[PDB]
Design a protein around this nucleic acid. Structure first.
Ligand code: KB5
Ligand code: ZN
Length: 271
DNA sequence: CTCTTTTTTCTCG
DNA sequence: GCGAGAAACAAAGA
């Protein structure tokens, strides 16, 4: 998932599991708990979920006053709220069991991670990761964004994907943002003019906030939190290779940029 | 059978 | 410090 999908999961979890006491925690893939599974099971069993927050693409469970469980879903991670008697599915790895149901984490590729850290170590954790600002008008300052772009010779798409200029863009939304802002993904950032940077800054906020409002992109929408998204119906370029651009009518092209599949309109996004 | 395709963090030169 | 490519892993399609 990208930031809008993670935010959708966050909202659903906030509505449903806040106030729930964890009865037990089980793992079939304990290796994904980077801070140690037995240690996490010992610390969190019997504790109450107080809230769910998010930073970039990271989900943060607030459990008791002193613990935070940092979860990253990476490429394919999925949570679901299931009955206590629900059968196990092939790629289910972890479960938090409550008195009236359970929260199951599944991940085909086993890339997702869990890390148990203390409340006062959350802000240093994200400082160490060098995560950039949230994509909001309040936190995403265009003036610093402009200065960072001016100083670099990096290509705009991979630089945006680094999460340092702004947090939360992944392959789908970076392609969508660059098409909306009429910028070629291989454009060197120090070549961008002030007006293009302004459009890019606002397009990042607008696309991500629209995707959040629509419940994220669910191209494969089934039996998991955040699966009822409608943003996939609003995609203009991502996965639209060979289809026509809604603005000019040229065919959308797919290329490889820094190892990622990249979808763009060659007319609207001049090299 | 092989090769390619689908977030983060590393090695290598 | 940099870019390129690989690594973690599983599965589907050409
Ligand atoms: N954390 C990242 N660093 C570099 N490139 C990236 N592409 C995506 S998606 N995430 C990252
Ligand atoms: Zn176009």
């Amino acid at each position: 998932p990208e930031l809008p999908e993670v935010e959708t999961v966050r909202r659903e979890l906030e509505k449903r599991i806040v106030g729930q006491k964890i009865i037990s925690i089980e793992a079939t893939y304990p290796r994904m708990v980077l801070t140690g599974f037995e240690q996490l099971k010992k610390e969190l069993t019997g504790k109450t979920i107080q809230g769910i927050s998010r930073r970039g693409k990271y989900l943060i469970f607030e459990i008791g006053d002193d613990f935070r469980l940092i979860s990253h879903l990476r490429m394919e991670g999925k949570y679901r709220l299931a009955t206590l008697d629900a059968p196990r599915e092939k790629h289910d790895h972890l479960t938090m069991k409550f008195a009236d149901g359970q929260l199951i984490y599944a991940d085909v590729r086993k890339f997702g991670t869990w890390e148990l850290i203390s409340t006062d170590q959350v802000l240093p954790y994200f400082l160490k990761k060098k995560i950039g600002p949230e994509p909001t008008y309040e936190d995403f300052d265009e003036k610093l964004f402009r200065e960072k772009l001016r100083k670099s010779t990096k290509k705009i798409k991979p630089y945006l994907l680094e999460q340092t200029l702004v947090a939360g863009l992944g392959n789908i939304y970076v392609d969508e943002v660059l098409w909306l802002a009429k910028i070629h993904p291989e454009k060197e950032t120090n070549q961008l003019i002030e007006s293009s940077i302004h459009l890019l800054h606002d397009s990042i906020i607008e696309i991500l906030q629209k995707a959040i409002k629509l419940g994220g992109s669910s191209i494969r929408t089934y039996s998991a939190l955040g699966s009822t998204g409608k943003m996939q119906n609003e995609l203009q370029v991502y996965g639209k290779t060979g289809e026509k651009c809604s603005r000019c009518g040229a065919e959308i092209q797919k290329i490889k940029v820094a190892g990622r599949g990249t979808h763009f309109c060659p007319v609207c996004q001049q090299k």
